[PDB]
Tab-separated table of C-alpha atoms and ligand atoms in Angstrom:
chain	number	residue	atom	x	y	z
A	2	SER	CA	-11.570	-19.086	10.538
A	3	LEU	CA	-7.748	-18.921	10.402
A	4	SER	CA	-5.748	-16.048	11.994
A	5	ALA	CA	-3.454	-13.635	10.151
A	6	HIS	CA	-0.392	-15.593	11.076
A	7	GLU	CA	-2.210	-18.741	10.265
A	8	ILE	CA	-3.219	-17.783	6.707
A	9	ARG	CA	0.314	-16.626	5.861
A	10	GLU	CA	1.746	-19.865	7.234
A	11	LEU	CA	-0.832	-21.900	5.253
A	12	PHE	CA	0.021	-20.068	2.016
A	13	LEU	CA	3.830	-20.491	2.079
A	14	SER	CA	3.645	-24.045	3.435
A	15	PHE	CA	1.028	-24.937	0.781
A	16	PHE	CA	3.013	-23.894	-2.285
A	17	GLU	CA	6.235	-25.376	-0.813
A	18	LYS	CA	4.310	-28.634	-1.286
A	19	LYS	CA	3.756	-27.542	-4.869
A	20	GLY	CA	7.501	-27.353	-5.318
A	21	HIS	CA	7.844	-23.673	-4.405
A	22	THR	CA	10.930	-22.954	-2.302
A	23	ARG	CA	9.773	-20.528	0.440
A	24	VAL	CA	11.764	-17.337	0.151
A	25	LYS	CA	12.245	-14.638	2.813
A	26	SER	CA	10.639	-11.329	2.080
A	27	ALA	CA	13.211	-8.786	0.956
A	28	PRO	CA	13.448	-5.481	2.863
A	29	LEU	CA	11.076	-2.685	2.069
A	30	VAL	CA	14.169	-0.861	0.839
A	31	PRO	CA	15.202	-1.997	-2.660
A	32	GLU	CA	18.820	-3.171	-2.733
A	33	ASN	CA	20.076	-2.138	-6.091
A	34	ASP	CA	17.431	0.247	-7.555
A	35	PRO	CA	17.546	3.884	-6.603
A	36	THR	CA	14.465	4.835	-8.561
A	37	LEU	CA	11.981	2.474	-6.860
A	38	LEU	CA	11.818	4.054	-3.287
A	39	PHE	CA	9.937	1.117	-1.695
A	40	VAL	CA	9.105	-2.441	-2.632
A	41	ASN	CA	5.451	-2.815	-3.707
A	42	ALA	CA	4.965	-6.570	-4.652
A	43	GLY	CA	6.331	-10.067	-4.383
A	44	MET	CA	7.864	-9.897	-7.833
A	45	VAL	CA	9.906	-6.815	-7.055
A	46	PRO	CA	13.036	-8.646	-5.809
A	47	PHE	CA	12.663	-11.175	-8.632
A	48	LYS	CA	12.181	-8.545	-11.381
A	49	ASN	CA	15.592	-9.477	-12.692
A	50	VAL	CA	14.609	-13.143	-12.909
A	51	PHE	CA	11.707	-12.721	-15.302
A	52	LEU	CA	14.058	-10.632	-17.389
A	53	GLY	CA	16.588	-13.483	-17.582
A	54	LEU	CA	19.475	-11.717	-15.794
A	55	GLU	CA	19.310	-13.785	-12.536
A	56	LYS	CA	19.157	-17.566	-12.484
A	57	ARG	CA	18.001	-18.587	-8.999
A	58	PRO	CA	18.551	-22.292	-8.167
A	59	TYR	CA	14.799	-22.786	-7.978
A	60	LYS	CA	12.397	-22.678	-10.936
A	61	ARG	CA	9.638	-22.008	-8.415
A	62	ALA	CA	9.420	-19.676	-5.465
A	63	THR	CA	6.729	-18.524	-3.040
A	64	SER	CA	6.840	-15.631	-0.588
A	65	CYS	CA	5.121	-13.177	1.710
A	66	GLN	CA	6.732	-9.885	0.679
A	67	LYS	CA	6.506	-6.819	2.803
A	68	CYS	CA	4.938	-3.998	0.654
A	69	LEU	CA	4.747	-0.236	0.883
A	70	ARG	CA	2.405	1.608	-1.526
A	71	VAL	CA	3.297	5.252	-0.928
A	72	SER	CA	5.428	6.247	-3.911
A	73	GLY	CA	5.451	6.412	-7.685
A	74	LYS	CA	2.379	5.356	-9.686
A	75	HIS	CA	1.137	3.155	-6.801
A	76	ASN	CA	0.537	5.823	-4.178
A	77	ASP	CA	-2.242	5.019	-1.787
A	78	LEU	CA	-1.094	7.176	1.116
A	79	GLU	CA	-3.975	9.528	0.287
A	80	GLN	CA	-6.874	7.142	0.879
A	81	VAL	CA	-5.245	5.584	3.940
A	82	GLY	CA	-7.721	6.003	6.830
A	83	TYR	CA	-10.619	6.998	4.535
A	84	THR	CA	-11.530	3.473	3.484
A	85	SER	CA	-11.330	-0.041	4.828
A	86	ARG	CA	-9.086	-1.516	2.154
A	87	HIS	CA	-6.168	0.964	1.632
A	88	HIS	CA	-2.903	0.604	3.474
A	89	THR	CA	0.582	2.079	3.128
A	90	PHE	CA	2.256	-1.023	4.544
A	91	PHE	CA	0.771	-4.400	3.729
A	92	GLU	CA	1.672	-8.093	3.342
A	93	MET	CA	1.476	-9.494	-0.176
A	94	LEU	CA	1.491	-13.255	-0.595
A	95	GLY	CA	2.253	-15.023	-3.826
A	96	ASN	CA	3.899	-17.643	-5.937
A	97	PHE	CA	6.284	-17.006	-8.782
A	98	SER	CA	7.273	-19.272	-11.683
A	99	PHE	CA	10.513	-18.497	-13.477
A	100	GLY	CA	9.861	-20.021	-16.860
A	101	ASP	CA	8.452	-23.107	-15.208
A	102	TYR	CA	4.783	-24.081	-15.150
A	103	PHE	CA	2.199	-21.753	-16.638
A	104	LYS	CA	-1.549	-21.010	-16.571
A	105	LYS	CA	-2.901	-24.592	-16.262
A	106	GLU	CA	-0.769	-24.934	-13.128
A	107	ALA	CA	-1.116	-21.433	-11.721
A	108	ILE	CA	-4.826	-21.824	-11.555
A	109	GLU	CA	-5.023	-25.311	-10.144
A	110	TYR	CA	-2.667	-24.376	-7.284
A	111	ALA	CA	-4.743	-21.256	-6.881
A	112	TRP	CA	-8.115	-22.939	-6.658
A	113	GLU	CA	-7.095	-25.715	-4.282
A	114	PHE	CA	-5.723	-23.175	-1.793
A	115	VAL	CA	-8.902	-21.075	-1.886
A	116	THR	CA	-11.309	-24.068	-1.546
A	117	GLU	CA	-9.319	-27.027	-0.291
A	118	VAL	CA	-7.205	-24.899	2.058
A	119	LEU	CA	-9.180	-21.712	2.864
A	120	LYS	CA	-12.385	-23.609	3.310
A	121	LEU	CA	-14.226	-21.006	1.223
A	122	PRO	CA	-17.148	-22.638	-0.568
A	123	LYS	CA	-16.919	-22.884	-4.350
A	124	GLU	CA	-20.497	-21.742	-4.663
A	125	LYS	CA	-19.674	-18.121	-3.786
A	126	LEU	CA	-16.470	-17.804	-5.774
A	127	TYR	CA	-16.002	-15.630	-8.803
A	128	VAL	CA	-13.147	-15.225	-11.355
A	129	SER	CA	-12.044	-13.010	-14.155
A	130	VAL	CA	-9.924	-13.402	-17.197
A	131	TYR	CA	-8.784	-11.292	-20.159
A	132	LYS	CA	-11.564	-11.622	-22.732
A	133	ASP	CA	-9.139	-12.298	-25.627
A	134	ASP	CA	-7.487	-14.929	-23.441
A	135	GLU	CA	-9.541	-18.012	-24.246
A	136	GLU	CA	-6.556	-19.989	-22.861
A	137	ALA	CA	-7.470	-19.085	-19.258
A	138	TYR	CA	-11.243	-19.353	-19.756
A	139	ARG	CA	-10.872	-22.992	-20.897
A	140	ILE	CA	-8.901	-24.031	-17.869
A	141	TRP	CA	-11.359	-22.285	-15.526
A	142	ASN	CA	-14.703	-23.141	-17.231
A	143	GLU	CA	-13.723	-26.449	-18.826
A	144	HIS	CA	-10.815	-28.055	-16.907
A	145	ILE	CA	-11.498	-26.905	-13.313
A	146	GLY	CA	-15.156	-27.039	-14.223
A	147	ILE	CA	-16.667	-23.719	-13.298
A	148	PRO	CA	-20.009	-22.318	-14.517
A	149	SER	CA	-19.723	-19.641	-17.214
A	150	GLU	CA	-22.114	-17.199	-15.437
A	151	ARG	CA	-19.596	-17.160	-12.582
A	152	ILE	CA	-16.723	-16.059	-14.839
A	153	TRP	CA	-16.188	-12.569	-16.262
A	154	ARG	CA	-14.235	-11.578	-19.415
A	155	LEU	CA	-13.166	-7.925	-19.072
A	156	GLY	CA	-10.856	-5.603	-21.055
A	157	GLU	CA	-7.229	-4.577	-20.772
A	158	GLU	CA	-7.744	-2.037	-17.923
A	159	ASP	CA	-9.015	-4.945	-15.791
A	160	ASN	CA	-7.191	-8.184	-16.948
A	161	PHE	CA	-3.819	-7.221	-18.490
A	162	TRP	CA	-0.798	-6.634	-16.218
A	163	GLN	CA	2.409	-4.971	-17.374
A	164	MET	CA	5.891	-4.581	-15.918
A	165	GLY	CA	6.197	-0.994	-17.137
A	166	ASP	CA	6.337	0.504	-20.624
A	167	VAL	CA	8.665	-2.171	-21.898
A	168	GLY	CA	9.403	-5.721	-20.766
A	169	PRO	CA	7.385	-8.871	-19.820
A	170	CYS	CA	3.676	-8.476	-19.422
A	171	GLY	CA	0.524	-10.253	-20.413
A	172	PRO	CA	-3.055	-11.286	-19.522
A	173	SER	CA	-4.140	-11.734	-15.939
A	174	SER	CA	-6.882	-13.425	-13.828
A	175	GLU	CA	-8.486	-12.304	-10.551
A	176	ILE	CA	-10.216	-14.421	-7.924
A	177	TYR	CA	-13.263	-12.697	-6.308
A	178	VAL	CA	-15.202	-13.835	-3.186
A	179	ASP	CA	-18.949	-13.006	-3.100
A	180	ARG	CA	-20.021	-11.566	0.303
A	181	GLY	CA	-23.798	-11.873	0.066
A	182	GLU	CA	-26.601	-9.383	-0.935
A	183	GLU	CA	-26.240	-6.718	1.675
A	184	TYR	CA	-23.023	-5.360	-0.034
A	185	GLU	CA	-22.512	-3.831	-3.446
A	186	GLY	CA	-19.681	-3.458	-5.960
A	187	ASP	CA	-16.017	-4.414	-5.372
A	188	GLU	CA	-17.049	-4.944	-1.743
A	189	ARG	CA	-19.448	-7.783	-2.230
A	190	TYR	CA	-17.049	-9.001	-4.918
A	191	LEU	CA	-13.861	-8.476	-2.980
A	192	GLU	CA	-10.668	-9.089	-4.914
A	193	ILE	CA	-8.653	-11.582	-2.942
A	194	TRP	CA	-6.094	-12.963	-5.426
A	195	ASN	CA	-4.369	-11.526	-8.550
A	196	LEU	CA	-2.929	-14.105	-10.847
A	197	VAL	CA	-0.656	-12.491	-13.361
A	198	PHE	CA	0.461	-14.321	-16.503
A	199	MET	CA	3.678	-13.010	-18.041
A	200	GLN	CA	3.067	-13.926	-21.594
A	201	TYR	CA	4.179	-11.091	-23.842
A	202	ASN	CA	7.121	-8.662	-23.761
A	203	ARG	CA	6.139	-5.236	-24.949
A	204	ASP	CA	8.833	-3.533	-26.978
A	205	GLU	CA	9.717	0.138	-27.501
A	206	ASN	CA	6.964	0.566	-30.138
A	207	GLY	CA	4.161	-0.962	-28.165
A	208	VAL	CA	4.108	-4.244	-30.059
A	209	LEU	CA	3.592	-7.475	-28.182
A	210	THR	CA	5.831	-10.498	-28.770
A	211	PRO	CA	5.442	-13.804	-26.846
A	212	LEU	CA	8.123	-15.105	-24.526
A	213	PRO	CA	10.001	-18.362	-25.000
A	214	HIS	CA	9.702	-19.169	-21.261
A	215	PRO	CA	6.523	-17.569	-19.657
A	216	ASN	CA	6.266	-16.682	-15.965
A	217	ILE	CA	3.795	-16.526	-13.121
A	218	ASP	CA	3.178	-13.689	-10.622
A	219	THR	CA	0.497	-13.764	-7.893
A	220	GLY	CA	-0.371	-11.283	-5.213
A	221	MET	CA	-2.982	-12.086	-2.538
A	222	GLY	CA	-3.433	-9.469	0.107
A	223	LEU	CA	-2.942	-11.099	3.551
A	224	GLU	CA	-4.918	-8.473	5.508
A	225	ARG	CA	-7.595	-8.416	2.715
A	226	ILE	CA	-8.315	-12.151	2.592
A	227	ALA	CA	-7.960	-12.378	6.319
A	228	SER	CA	-11.021	-10.064	6.572
A	229	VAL	CA	-13.111	-12.628	4.635
A	230	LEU	CA	-12.047	-15.668	6.734
A	231	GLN	CA	-12.403	-13.590	9.972
A	232	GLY	CA	-15.931	-12.638	8.957
A	233	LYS	CA	-14.959	-8.990	9.003
A	234	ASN	CA	-15.882	-6.030	6.797
A	235	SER	CA	-12.797	-4.037	7.311
A	236	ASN	CA	-9.015	-4.870	7.013
A	237	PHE	CA	-8.686	-2.854	10.161
A	238	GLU	CA	-10.726	-5.392	12.113
A	239	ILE	CA	-8.309	-8.302	11.783
A	240	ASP	CA	-6.677	-9.993	14.755
A	241	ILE	CA	-3.459	-8.160	13.917
A	242	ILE	CA	-4.609	-4.536	13.306
A	243	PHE	CA	-7.649	-4.082	15.617
A	244	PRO	CA	-5.496	-4.046	18.802
A	245	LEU	CA	-3.743	-1.131	17.161
A	246	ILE	CA	-7.076	0.725	16.676
A	247	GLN	CA	-8.084	0.202	20.376
A	248	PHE	CA	-4.572	1.472	21.225
A	249	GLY	CA	-5.790	4.767	19.607
A	250	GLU	CA	-9.050	4.522	21.451
A	251	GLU	CA	-7.085	4.210	24.731
A	252	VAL	CA	-4.557	6.982	23.995
A	253	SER	CA	-7.312	9.508	23.048
A	254	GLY	CA	-10.287	8.113	25.035
A	255	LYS	CA	-12.372	8.094	21.886
A	256	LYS	CA	-14.061	4.990	20.588
A	257	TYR	CA	-14.969	3.345	17.262
A	258	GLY	CA	-18.460	3.742	15.738
A	259	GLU	CA	-19.514	7.386	16.327
A	260	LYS	CA	-18.208	9.908	13.880
A	261	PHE	CA	-16.555	9.646	10.515
A	262	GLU	CA	-13.648	12.005	11.089
A	263	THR	CA	-12.850	9.874	14.141
A	264	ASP	CA	-12.730	6.326	12.839
A	265	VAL	CA	-10.373	7.734	10.163
A	266	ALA	CA	-7.644	8.944	12.548
A	267	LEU	CA	-8.002	5.632	14.356
A	268	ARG	CA	-7.204	3.815	11.149
A	269	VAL	CA	-4.569	6.299	10.415
A	270	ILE	CA	-2.630	5.637	13.641
A	271	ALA	CA	-2.880	1.832	13.380
A	272	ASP	CA	-1.969	1.783	9.666
A	273	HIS	CA	0.817	4.436	9.755
A	274	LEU	CA	2.111	2.602	12.852
A	275	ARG	CA	2.825	-0.457	10.779
A	276	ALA	CA	4.386	1.641	8.086
A	277	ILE	CA	6.812	3.572	10.301
A	278	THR	CA	7.599	0.330	12.245
A	279	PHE	CA	8.816	-2.037	9.539
A	280	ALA	CA	10.315	0.900	7.651
A	281	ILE	CA	12.737	1.925	10.350
A	282	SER	CA	13.544	-1.700	10.937
A	283	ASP	CA	14.452	-2.047	7.247
A	284	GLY	CA	16.837	0.854	7.634
A	285	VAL	CA	15.033	4.172	7.240
A	286	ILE	CA	15.480	7.302	9.292
A	287	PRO	CA	13.176	10.363	9.288
A	288	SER	CA	14.971	12.857	6.943
A	289	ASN	CA	13.769	15.473	4.416
A	290	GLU	CA	13.880	13.636	1.049
A	291	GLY	CA	13.002	10.515	-0.791
A	292	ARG	CA	12.475	7.385	1.266
A	293	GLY	CA	13.599	9.039	4.441
A	294	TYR	CA	11.006	11.713	3.916
A	295	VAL	CA	8.185	9.144	3.212
A	296	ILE	CA	8.521	7.820	6.786
A	297	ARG	CA	8.567	11.356	8.121
A	298	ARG	CA	5.338	12.132	6.261
A	299	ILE	CA	3.731	8.948	7.447
A	300	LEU	CA	4.937	9.695	10.949
A	301	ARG	CA	3.836	13.343	10.743
A	302	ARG	CA	0.366	12.515	9.460
A	303	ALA	CA	-0.096	10.124	12.343
A	304	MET	CA	1.076	12.985	14.636
A	305	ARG	CA	-1.667	15.204	13.106
A	306	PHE	CA	-4.658	12.915	13.338
A	307	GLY	CA	-3.538	12.098	16.837
A	308	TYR	CA	-3.512	15.786	17.663
A	309	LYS	CA	-6.846	15.977	15.993
A	310	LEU	CA	-8.040	13.363	18.468
A	311	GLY	CA	-6.755	15.463	21.357
A	312	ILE	CA	-3.622	13.452	22.091
A	313	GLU	CA	-1.242	16.280	22.981
A	314	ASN	CA	1.818	14.063	23.676
A	315	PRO	CA	4.129	11.695	21.865
A	316	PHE	CA	2.172	8.413	21.699
A	317	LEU	CA	3.193	6.505	18.541
A	318	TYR	CA	6.386	5.497	20.326
A	319	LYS	CA	4.241	3.311	22.559
A	320	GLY	CA	2.548	1.856	19.510
A	321	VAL	CA	5.885	0.440	18.160
A	322	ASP	CA	5.900	-2.240	20.939
A	323	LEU	CA	2.389	-3.417	20.128
A	324	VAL	CA	3.331	-4.025	16.469
A	325	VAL	CA	6.453	-5.950	17.280
A	326	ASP	CA	4.452	-8.042	19.670
A	327	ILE	CA	1.745	-8.746	17.118
A	328	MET	CA	4.201	-9.231	14.293
A	329	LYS	CA	7.087	-11.047	16.114
A	330	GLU	CA	5.936	-14.426	15.000
A	331	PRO	CA	6.396	-14.159	11.191
A	332	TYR	CA	9.015	-11.480	11.556
A	333	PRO	CA	10.949	-12.153	14.809
A	334	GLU	CA	13.523	-9.744	13.338
A	335	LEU	CA	11.455	-6.819	14.665
A	336	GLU	CA	12.130	-7.655	18.328
A	337	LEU	CA	15.792	-6.695	17.827
A	338	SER	CA	14.700	-3.419	16.175
A	339	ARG	CA	11.913	-2.776	18.772
A	340	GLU	CA	13.788	-0.494	21.188
A	341	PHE	CA	15.838	0.880	18.296
A	342	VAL	CA	12.775	1.864	16.269
A	343	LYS	CA	11.114	2.958	19.538
A	344	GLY	CA	13.737	5.637	20.025
A	345	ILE	CA	13.216	6.887	16.520
A	346	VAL	CA	9.465	7.263	16.515
A	347	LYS	CA	9.844	8.924	19.940
A	348	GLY	CA	12.700	11.037	18.698
A	349	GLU	CA	10.680	12.478	15.815
A	350	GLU	CA	7.526	13.181	17.794
A	351	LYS	CA	9.209	15.212	20.580
A	352	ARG	CA	11.063	17.089	17.889
A	353	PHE	CA	8.089	18.294	15.682
A	354	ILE	CA	5.274	18.019	18.206
A	355	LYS	CA	5.609	21.691	19.431
A	356	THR	CA	5.707	22.854	15.784
A	357	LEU	CA	2.955	20.597	14.649
A	358	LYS	CA	0.632	22.257	17.177
A	359	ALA	CA	1.737	25.869	16.595
A	360	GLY	CA	1.147	25.163	12.967
A	361	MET	CA	-2.343	23.711	13.414
A	362	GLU	CA	-3.237	27.039	15.105
A	363	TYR	CA	-1.750	28.950	12.169
A	364	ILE	CA	-3.252	26.905	9.300
A	365	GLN	CA	-6.719	26.716	10.860
A	366	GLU	CA	-6.433	30.507	11.535
A	367	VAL	CA	-6.048	31.229	7.847
A	368	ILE	CA	-8.892	28.804	7.033
A	369	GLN	CA	-11.856	30.545	8.616
A	370	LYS	CA	-10.094	33.810	7.761
A	371	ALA	CA	-10.015	32.823	4.104
A	372	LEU	CA	-13.623	31.561	3.802
A	373	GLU	CA	-14.889	34.786	5.237
A	374	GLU	CA	-13.378	36.971	2.564
A	375	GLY	CA	-14.890	34.553	0.071
A	376	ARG	CA	-11.570	32.808	-0.871
A	377	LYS	CA	-11.939	29.216	-2.114
A	378	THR	CA	-8.223	28.508	-1.630
A	379	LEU	CA	-5.212	29.211	0.544
A	380	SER	CA	-2.689	31.710	-0.775
A	381	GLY	CA	0.741	30.643	-1.928
A	382	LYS	CA	2.267	32.743	0.879
A	383	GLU	CA	0.180	30.750	3.383
A	384	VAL	CA	0.723	27.127	2.426
A	385	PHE	CA	4.429	28.034	2.214
A	386	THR	CA	4.554	29.448	5.734
A	387	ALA	CA	3.234	26.163	6.893
A	388	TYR	CA	5.733	24.323	4.715
A	389	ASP	CA	8.749	26.250	5.878
A	390	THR	CA	8.005	28.124	9.042
A	391	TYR	CA	6.313	24.910	10.242
A	392	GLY	CA	7.911	22.083	8.211
A	393	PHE	CA	4.382	20.737	7.407
A	394	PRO	CA	4.395	18.357	4.429
A	395	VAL	CA	2.693	20.063	1.516
A	396	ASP	CA	0.225	17.161	1.203
A	397	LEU	CA	-0.766	17.487	4.833
A	398	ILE	CA	-1.362	21.194	4.555
A	399	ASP	CA	-3.760	20.155	1.755
A	400	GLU	CA	-5.605	17.574	3.757
A	401	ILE	CA	-5.950	20.018	6.669
A	402	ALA	CA	-7.542	22.678	4.453
A	403	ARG	CA	-9.544	20.147	2.340
A	404	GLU	CA	-11.699	19.585	5.387
A	405	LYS	CA	-13.354	22.989	5.270
A	406	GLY	CA	-13.671	22.529	1.487
A	407	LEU	CA	-10.843	25.055	0.912
A	408	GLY	CA	-8.039	24.270	-1.570
A	409	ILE	CA	-4.627	25.674	-2.135
A	410	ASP	CA	-3.753	27.802	-5.163
A	411	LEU	CA	-1.133	25.652	-6.715
A	412	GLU	CA	0.337	28.402	-8.964
A	413	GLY	CA	0.735	30.572	-5.839
A	414	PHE	CA	2.782	27.826	-4.140
A	415	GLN	CA	4.549	27.509	-7.480
A	416	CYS	CA	5.544	31.164	-7.834
A	417	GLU	CA	6.296	31.281	-4.110
A	418	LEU	CA	8.755	28.435	-4.488
A	419	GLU	CA	10.534	30.381	-7.280
A	420	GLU	CA	10.421	33.479	-5.141
A	421	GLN	CA	12.718	31.517	-2.727
A	422	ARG	CA	14.952	29.748	-5.185
A	423	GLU	CA	15.696	33.216	-6.704
A	424	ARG	CA	15.711	34.910	-3.292
A	425	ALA	CA	17.873	32.433	-1.431
A	426	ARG	CA	20.007	32.459	-4.553
A	427	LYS	CA	20.411	36.171	-4.523
A	428	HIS	CA	20.247	37.857	-1.108
A	438	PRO	CA	20.429	17.117	-1.118
A	439	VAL	CA	17.654	17.526	-3.862
A	440	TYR	CA	17.900	19.384	-7.142
A	441	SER	CA	14.651	20.539	-8.753
A	442	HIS	CA	13.764	22.177	-12.043
A	443	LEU	CA	11.746	25.380	-12.354
A	444	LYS	CA	7.976	25.010	-13.063
A	445	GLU	CA	8.637	21.477	-11.906
A	446	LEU	CA	9.039	22.539	-8.336
A	447	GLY	CA	5.523	21.394	-7.549
A	448	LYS	CA	6.228	17.907	-8.865
A	449	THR	CA	8.846	17.523	-6.207
A	450	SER	CA	7.712	19.843	-3.410
A	451	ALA	CA	5.231	17.107	-2.388
A	452	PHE	CA	7.979	14.548	-1.897
A	453	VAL	CA	10.836	16.566	-0.382
A	454	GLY	CA	11.050	18.825	2.635
A	455	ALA	CA	11.867	22.524	2.498
A	456	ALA	CA	15.182	21.835	4.196
A	457	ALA	CA	16.046	19.443	1.335
A	458	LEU	CA	14.283	20.918	-1.604
B	1	ATP	N1	-3.612	-1.013	0.171
B	1	ATP	C1	-4.028	-2.309	0.226
B	1	ATP	N2	-4.699	-2.715	1.347
B	1	ATP	C2	-5.202	-4.008	1.372
B	1	ATP	N3	-5.194	-4.986	0.473
B	1	ATP	C3	-4.528	-4.508	-0.676
B	1	ATP	C4	-4.027	-3.243	-0.899
B	1	ATP	N4	-3.467	-3.153	-2.151
B	1	ATP	C5	-3.701	-4.298	-2.673
B	1	ATP	N5	-4.358	-5.183	-1.878
B	1	ATP	C6	-4.812	-6.625	-2.070
B	1	ATP	O1	-3.737	-7.218	-2.776
B	1	ATP	C7	-4.329	-7.928	-3.932
B	1	ATP	C8	-3.208	-7.912	-5.056
B	1	ATP	O2	-2.847	-6.550	-5.374
B	1	ATP	P1	-3.330	-5.948	-6.805
B	1	ATP	O3	-2.110	-5.268	-7.421
B	1	ATP	O4	-4.087	-6.883	-7.591
B	1	ATP	O5	-4.328	-4.816	-6.291
B	1	ATP	P2	-5.242	-3.772	-7.099
B	1	ATP	O6	-5.192	-4.164	-8.557
B	1	ATP	O7	-4.652	-2.462	-6.715
B	1	ATP	O8	-6.745	-3.970	-6.543
B	1	ATP	P3	-7.502	-3.210	-5.390
B	1	ATP	O9	-8.133	-2.089	-6.183
B	1	ATP	O10	-8.551	-4.111	-4.731
B	1	ATP	O11	-6.446	-2.637	-4.364
B	1	ATP	C9	-5.504	-7.145	-4.301
B	1	ATP	O12	-6.457	-7.970	-4.982
B	1	ATP	C10	-6.030	-6.834	-2.864
B	1	ATP	O13	-6.737	-7.969	-2.486
B	2	MG	MG1	-6.127	-0.697	-6.233
B	3	MG	MG1	-8.391	-4.717	-9.896
B	4	MG	MG1	-5.450	-6.249	-9.537
């Protein structure tokens, strides 16, 4: 069945055998790249290798990179807690080939692990390849010997990965595990591995030119595949995250399997706990802008659902220990940051807790008040009060109102923001005008 810490260890040890020097996951905080707030894949730290800038001693490298999908174009923070497959923090596993082997090797080493290493029968496996990429279809169907009906040839939106507007990109291939007949869609056909084939380098005009030395990039979700092997139907039910859920059950008294708006918060605490744990360990302090404000948002949204559960006291600080204990094997580093990070998560809570509550009474007050006078949204002078007078993240104010079906007049919040940038300026983060709303959801009032 393999445990979480067993699958990760089987992955890295397996490819090491395939000539892949095991590398240590870089910190969630990008070293020399101010734009990319948080890492998001195993090829992030090696982005300068595929480019040809760096020349690591090894032509091959495997790693379990710590990822955080809460910024830029890959922002999942919204669906976190609403589904069973979306996390902020998550462990990505993968192999990378720096102009070494290619598709014929990337697949072989990818099929042996899934069948000869994960003990998943080859009768329920499924794969995908870029239709116009007969190169991969041959290896799969002909070489490896897989039936055609079990292979899908999709378009660009499904089988063509790119490293931005310009740079190395190319066709891809995904490995899907069939979960029976009781399920439907991407569930029954859970994506478990993403094999990316850097073949072409898109120029500034959108034209694709081949590379003289192709590359390989793979990203298998640890928690996601762990679900399969652990016969679970939720990434939140794995040996490493469930204890965190029950931790919520115990802090509130509530249990799993009853209401929808309850299982959510439970997943919210457990997930966000992982986020705010490794984050602070990798050098992030709750501030009012950029990275430092992403942790604060994640830590404040946990604070909210916790309060929605009835937990009227700082609790996440107790959850930091559980994480270190569950994650001290692959990342012993956390132990040293345990007490450290424990003081931080406890420091933030006792700071905003009193405000977080007062605010919940304010916001909810203008909710029923609004829907009575027939308003379908919250006024700009209302979401702002909660943003300033209460330090509530603008995204949170939105989620708190979205419950009753109410929205928030964007333009109002827009004008209201100008009514303060002109007021404060008449009677760090710099933001344009009319572009205030494209930054007000990522920076606090005190920093905006
Ligand atoms: N938030 C997440 N929580 C859990 N697993 C994830 C998450 N994001 C990605 N994964 C897993 O990591 C694998 C590699 O990431 P990839 O970039 O292919 O994801 P994706 O294209 O966003 O697909 P998906 O829609 O299933 O998240 C995915 O196939 C999936 O198994
Ligand atoms: Mg996705
Ligand atoms: Mg996909
Ligand atoms: Mg994918």
